[PDB]
Amino acid sequence: TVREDNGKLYLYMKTIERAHFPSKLWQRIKLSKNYAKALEQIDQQLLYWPGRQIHRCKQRLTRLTQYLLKARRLALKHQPALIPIKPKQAHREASRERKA
Amino acid sequence: QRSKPASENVYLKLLVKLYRFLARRTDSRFNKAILKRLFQSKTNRPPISISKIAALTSRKSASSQNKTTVVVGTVTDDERMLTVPKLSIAALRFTKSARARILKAGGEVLTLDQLALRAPTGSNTVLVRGKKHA
Amino acid sequence: VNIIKKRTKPFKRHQSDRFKRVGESWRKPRGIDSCVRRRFRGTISMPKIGYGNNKKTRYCMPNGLKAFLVRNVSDVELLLMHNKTYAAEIAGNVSARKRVEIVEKARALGVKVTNAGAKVRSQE
Amino acid sequence: AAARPTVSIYNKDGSVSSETLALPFVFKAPIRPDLVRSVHTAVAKNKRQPYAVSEKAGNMCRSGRMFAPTKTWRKWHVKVNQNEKRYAIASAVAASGVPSLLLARGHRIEEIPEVPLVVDDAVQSFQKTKEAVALLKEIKAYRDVIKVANSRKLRAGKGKLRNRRHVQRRGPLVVFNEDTGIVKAFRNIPGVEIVNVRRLNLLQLAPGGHLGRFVIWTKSAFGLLDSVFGSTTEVAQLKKNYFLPENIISNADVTRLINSDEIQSIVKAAGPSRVKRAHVQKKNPLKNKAVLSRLNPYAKAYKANVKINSEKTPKAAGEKFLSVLHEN
RNA sequence: AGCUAAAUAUUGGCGAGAGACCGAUAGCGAACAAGUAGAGUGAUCGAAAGAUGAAAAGAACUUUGAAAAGAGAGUUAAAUAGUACGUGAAAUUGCUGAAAGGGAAGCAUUGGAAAUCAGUCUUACCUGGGUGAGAUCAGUAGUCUCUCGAGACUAUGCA
RNA sequence: UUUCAAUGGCCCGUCUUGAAACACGGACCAAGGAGUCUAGCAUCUAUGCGAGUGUUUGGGUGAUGAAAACCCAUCCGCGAAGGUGGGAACGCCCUUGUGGCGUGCACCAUCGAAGAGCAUAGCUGUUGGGACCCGAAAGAUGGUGAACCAUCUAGUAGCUGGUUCCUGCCGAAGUUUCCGGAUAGCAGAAACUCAGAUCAGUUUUAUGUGUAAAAUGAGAGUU
RNA sequence: UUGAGAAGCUCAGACGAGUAGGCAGGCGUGGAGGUUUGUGACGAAGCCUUGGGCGUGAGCCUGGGUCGAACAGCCUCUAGUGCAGAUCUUGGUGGAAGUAGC
RNA sequence: GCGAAACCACAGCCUGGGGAACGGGCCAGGCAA
RNA sequence: AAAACUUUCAGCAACGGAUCUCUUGGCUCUCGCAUCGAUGAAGAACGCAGCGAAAUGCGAUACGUAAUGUGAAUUG
């Protein structure tokens, strides 16, 4: 699988021969920022794996990058805050006003 | 009609999964027959005794050679007969008394999965059934 | 494959309009001489399997997305790879605190939130 | 059935030890989610108390006798054959060694060094619950206890009005062999249940009916597993005449059975996984000229109209035929 | 002719622990003044009735009214909690606004009209250069956990 | 959403009746409200074991509810007391295919004379038990001042009224025949054997309207 | 070509009345063991509302208003579990009616 | 001024025909303010 | 045709007390124990508080005294 950890997409892999040791089960490697080099990394690491399995990892790497991109652009723009609404202060101010 | 077992033995839903593939991807009638009988109820699968199997392989002209008897169902023993002959048997289940008696004096016992990897097409196998009347 | 429905109007119970003890939930009329059960003219319709919608369109909102109920912010993360077909419905009891955490996370994830403007208020 | 011959014993400090134990025969027994369910289903009705109404006290009348007065002689306890109970519990023990069925039950064992998790006999001599937390945090099993602590909600509904106030998950299970202070060490740790090897309980190895409770064996308890359950050939010394179940199949991995050479070398050809749609539409041979060529490899050369006249047409009519035609 | 422990019973009495039990039309007839009021010459029969709020802070005071009460005003997080007190549903009734209203109404289809909500989004992508950067990059130097190299970092330069 | 315009639509449930006609029950709203609990029997399915089978009378035991779990001694219950052909499956082929040669399960024909249960759980059925819910004067015992009260009592019913959510599939019979019934039939549900085999609210051909042997169709027959 | 919840995916054709009755899959309520490292004073449950949706349907999800302390999705266990009727029980409330009338 | 009970599916122009009453609802009609 | 009256829908106020939440109550099972009276019991009546409406408590030593404790509250 491909899942991000603090702004960096890592490739997590497990094998049958490490399935009985939960601590050391998931070998992890780091995928580079260059998208073209990222895909060469997946193939040279997921090689001779089923084409289905390498297919799903590339999609996730694609779909995770678009997440990281969107997280960046939203930070750049000065998007509005979302100050919530309280049902107790709204009521108390509604009653105190009417009396005023 | 019957195309899904009523059972919930999870390993019988793996045995059927093996013989659903074999039945539809080979031209043998042994597989199409085996798959059908993996669907049958517990009532329709009678126990087949060891002595009845021993008589069938060593029947008339004998000449047992090394044919493998295959039955879907248990294979209970028969203490009423002392000398069991050499037998290769495949079945869903054995009884600990029977399986020891086959193993101790003669050949070996097999499950339906070990027969398939040896004779996927039913190659030189006797497919028997127990007495249904009961 | 567009979102097309075989019927808009709901199925109301027969005579549910006349009475108030009679609920509008559809109940099959089992009356032996019931002419409305007998499918006469001027009567009401009745649910049939013939009214089912396209199996590639069942559960689909008019904009093509299927509603998906996210309780917390963990749930909004797993819609990372189905954002083009599912829309993160926010549960009704999720507080305004976590409600913003769900909407801000879902905005960057790329998924569509259906009730993103509930109990909250923007500030510039 | 070939799997993982040896397991490694972890000391108090958390470091592995050079000693090892052969994986007990019980840890290969069949895993049966249906059989554990229909046994836990029964065995869980065995600590029930009877309830009823006052026999002295129709159904529709206010202050009336409700239909069918609840009667204390209802069936409260359900019988299961012992060999069904041992099978459901040998299966329950087998499924506690498979890490997947532990995560899939909700156990936070993503950092546990090894499954089945075995410690040495020094854990049985603990005295203080600081020590158990000391050990748990060096085996990285404390994630389970920190999960259960955060999961301590208040019950939903009229249960909490009935001495059933709180709810929470189930933590790790510590299976010991001798009581010398382990039972009073770990017990206050939320969720952590301690049960002896010789009296393993299905409500504690298959809670909720679901297989795969996280068990933390000890070395003395693990070594007794070969004697409390037995083997498929020998017999448990402690359970008389009891042999572990024998399965329907040996190799439970079907995809290996099917995708092996010994089968894939004899199957006939392979069809497509999805067959393309042939004749999706019906095109009229008359209306469409291209479909006509598909069906009529003659329509290219017809020349239907032919001049069979303007060649001195021999007017043919019998004179007597005309006479009988123009009569009466 | 006679006695005699323990093993056994237990809708009562003295206490105790629990429950996949009922949750105020239920569970006892009784969650409270419950065999209580009340009914019956009598024997007997026999109910209805739980919840302001954290705290009473239970509404001073002014005013109108014979009072009862009302209006100001106060307390409170809130009086859409004011002792007719938790939430306050339906039936049902009054006021207002709306449209409609030749012995019914009623609903169903199709619209129209009035009234009102559904939801809006060019914006990003790609490419070009410059400018400063950083690092998963150094013809680079160290530590940590793993299994040479795979991670997390700490310097240092930004090719 | 309200309203209007055009087209429409006899009050619902029960019971009755082919059908209605009906006669009933319905002022309105909320809440309560009726196949349940249990022992026995048989069936189907699931599971464990299998010539066996069943720990829970009881004993051992259970430090973290200890009425759970776990373990087994002596009984006991229920079981246990040969050829011929057609045949499932397989092999050998070999003019291959076609078929033959075989080996022949379950079983059926024939001639004849190599045990399959036990236990648990479910489903449906049936018999009892207050027995789906409601409704018939009671009667008896014992009391109170012909009357009245309390219990036995969940006394009695072929009858009356009612019996509660959705969709999908199949779907009769509505009556022969003997005689309140056993049959049958229709519908299913299972197990079988065959389409190279039989059939048909069929039609012809022809022999003497019946019978027997061509077309038109459909796979047909059993338990 | 990624389409192995093999209980999946895919392809083709015909078909669709229904009482008695037979079979199957589901929806909903109270509580029970497991679970969601679930929701909740930044508002649970409930309630109303011509707000928006989902399902053939039983039903479900959500917005707003009230509200104030609990609750739920999923897998199984379980039962005092689903109402329009019973001249049904209990409570409430109308027309009749400001009528009979006093 | 003090104030019920009974009753209540819902209503209420007929004309005819509407086969089984049909008029209290259906169709032709008039009426319908 | 507007008003009046009749009708539907919405707002608001009454009316009603369902729903939801709980709960010093009920029911059910298990467990331990052995204890009334002529030395006046059970029951009943009349009394009694700095004031009690019921309600408990108490007996002219009356909402109790002695004694052993606890150690500063009763509480409208």
From Swiss-Prot, chain A:
Annotated TM spans: none
Task: State the source organism's domain of life.
Answer: Eukaryota
Which positions does the motif Nuclear localization signal occupy? 87-92
Q: Where in the cell is it found?
A: Cytoplasm; Nucleus
Q: Indicate the family of this protein.
A: Belongs to the MAK16 family.
Record's protein name = Protein mak16
Q: Which organism is it from?
A: Schizosaccharomyces pombe (strain 972 / ATCC 24843)
> Gene that codes for this?
mak16
Q: Which residues of the full protein are shown?
A: 52 to 151 of 302
From Swiss-Prot, chain B:
Q: Which GO terms describe its cellular component?
A: cytosol; cytosolic large ribosomal subunit; preribosome
Task: Classify the main location.
Answer: cytoplasm
One example of a Gene Ontology biological process annotation? cytoplasmic translation
Q: Does the keyword Isomerase apply?
A: no
Describe its partners and assembly state: Component of the large ribosomal subunit (LSU). Mature yeast ribosomes consist of a small (40S) and a large (60S) subunit. The 40S small subunit contains 1 molecule of ribosomal RNA (18S rRNA) and at least 33 different proteins. The large 60S subunit contains 3 rRNA molecules (25S, 5.8S and 5S rRNA) and at least 46 different proteins. eL18 interacts with NAP1.
Additional detail = There are 2 genes for eL18 in S.pombe.
In Swiss-Prot or TrEMBL terms, this protein is called: Large ribosomal subunit protein eL18A
Protein species of origin: Schizosaccharomyces pombe (strain 972 / ATCC 24843)
For this protein's source organism, the top of the classification is: Eukaryota, Fungi, Dikarya, Ascomycota, Taphrinomycotina
Note the residue range shown relative to the complete protein.
14 to 147 of 187
Curated annotation (Swiss-Prot), chain C:
A Pfam family (short name) is: Ribosomal_L32e
Q: Which GO terms describe its biological process?
A: cytoplasmic translation
Q: Where does this chain mainly localize?
A: cytoplasm
> Matching InterPro entries, A to Z?
Ribosomal_eL32, Ribosomal_eL32_CS, Ribosomal_eL32_sf
UniProt keyword terms in alphabetical order:
Cytoplasm, Nucleus, Phosphoprotein, Ribonucleoprotein, Ribosomal protein
SUPFAM superfamilies linked to this entry: Ribosomal protein L32e (SSF52042)
| Residues with Phosphoserine modification | S74
Q: Does the keyword Transmembrane apply?
A: no
Q: Where is the protein situated, by its record's location annotation?
A: Cytoplasm; Nucleus
> What range does the record give for the signal peptide?
none
Which GO terms fall under molecular function for this chain's record?
Answer: structural constituent of ribosome
One cellular-component annotation, GO: nucleus
Function description = Component of the ribosome, a large ribonucleoprotein complex responsible for the synthesis of proteins in the cell. The small ribosomal subunit (SSU) binds messenger RNAs (mRNAs) and translates the encoded message by selecting cognate aminoacyl-transfer RNA (tRNA) molecules. The large subunit (LSU) contains the ribosomal catalytic site termed the peptidyl transferase center (PTC), which catalyzes the formation of peptide bonds, thereby polymerizing the amino acids delivered by tRNAs into a polypeptide chain.
Quaternary structure and interacting proteins, as annotated: Component of the large ribosomal subunit (LSU). Mature yeast ribosomes consist of a small (40S) and a large (60S) subunit. The 40S small subunit contains 1 molecule of ribosomal RNA (18S rRNA) and at least 33 different proteins. The large 60S subunit contains 3 rRNA molecules (25S, 5.8S and 5S rRNA) and at least 46 different proteins.
Sequence similarity: Belongs to the eukaryotic ribosomal protein eL32 family.
Question: Further remark, if any?
Answer: There are 2 genes for eL32 in S.pombe.
Name the gene.
Answer: rpl3202
Curated annotation (Swiss-Prot), chain D:
Organism superkingdom: Eukaryota
Q: Which GO terms describe its cellular component?
A: cytosol; cytosolic large ribosomal subunit; preribosome
User: Which residue ranges does the record annotate as region C-terminal-extended nuclear localization signal?
Assistant: 245-328
Locations listed in the record: Cytoplasm
The molecular function GO annotations come to: RNA binding; structural constituent of ribosome
Q: What are the recorded Gene Ontology BP terms?
A: cytoplasmic translation
Which InterPro entries does the annotation name?
Ribos_uL4_C_dom (IPR025755), Ribosomal_uL4 (IPR002136), Ribosomal_uL4_dom_sf (IPR023574), Ribosomal_uL4_euk/arc_CS (IPR013000), Ribosomal_uL4_euk/arch (IPR045240)
What does the subunit section of this Swiss-Prot or TrEMBL entry state? Component of the large ribosomal subunit (LSU). Mature yeast ribosomes consist of a small (40S) and a large (60S) subunit. The 40S small subunit contains 1 molecule of ribosomal RNA (18S rRNA) and at least 33 different proteins. The large 60S subunit contains 3 rRNA molecules (25S, 5.8S and 5S rRNA) and at least 46 different proteins. uL4 is associated with the polypeptide exit tunnel. uL4 interacts with its chaperone ACL4 and the nuclear import receptor KAP104.
Concerning its family, UniProt says: Belongs to the universal ribosomal protein uL4 family.
Q: What else is known?
A: There are 2 genes for uL4 in S.pombe.
- Name the chain's protein: Large ribosomal subunit protein uL4B
